């Protein structure tokens, strides 16, 4: 009966939970972690990461 | 030992890692530090900040 | 080159400062780590291949 209200909580939830999912993502890069591209590599090739 | 560089033996070495997939059994001089408790602190686990 | 040899390397400390201190290496190229960062880290699986 209360599906649309639901629907909305449940799209919201979801686009934050996605959006955090995001932050696993290498996209392209070495490593997803910030802080292990910086322990591990210099500034010429950390800036690129 | 006549001919020219390009051409001389040369002795290569390949060192092979892997980052954080597992524990670690090989380390850096580093000293360890005690632990504390409930509080804000800037962490390093086996090469994890 | 054929029969290269792979040795282990675990269970223990590695100071690379005395790599920099005495080298005639020529070539010290390093693809996914810095080399002034590795006395700062820990590493497992890790191989020489000569």
């Not at chain 2, 030992?1 to 290569?12: A, E, F, M, W």
């Not at chain 2, 524990?23 to 580093?30: F, I, R």
């Not at chain 3, 190229?29 to 497992?44: H, I």
Request: aromatic share 12%; net charge positive.
């Amino acid at each position: 009966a209360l599906g649309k209200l639901q629907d909305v909580v449940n799209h919201n939830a979801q686009a934050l939970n996605t959006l955090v999912k995001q932050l696993s993502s290498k996209f392209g890069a070495i490593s997803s972690v910030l802080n292990d591209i910086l322990s591990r590599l210099d500034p010429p090739e950390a800036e690129v990461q | 030992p006549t001919y020219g560089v390009g051409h001389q033996p040369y002795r290569v070495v390949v060192l092979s890692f892997e980052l954080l997939h597992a524990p670690a059994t090989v380390c850096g001089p580093k000293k360890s530090t005690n632990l504390v408790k409930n509080k804000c602190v800037n962490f390093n686990f086996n090469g994890l900040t | 080159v054929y029969a290269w040899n792979r040795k282990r390397i675990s269970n223990c400390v590695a100071d690379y400062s005395v790599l920099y201190n005495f080298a005639p290496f020529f070539a010290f190229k390093c693809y996914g780590v810095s080399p002034t960062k590795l006395n700062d880290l820990c590493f497992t699986n890790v191989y020489a291949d000569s």
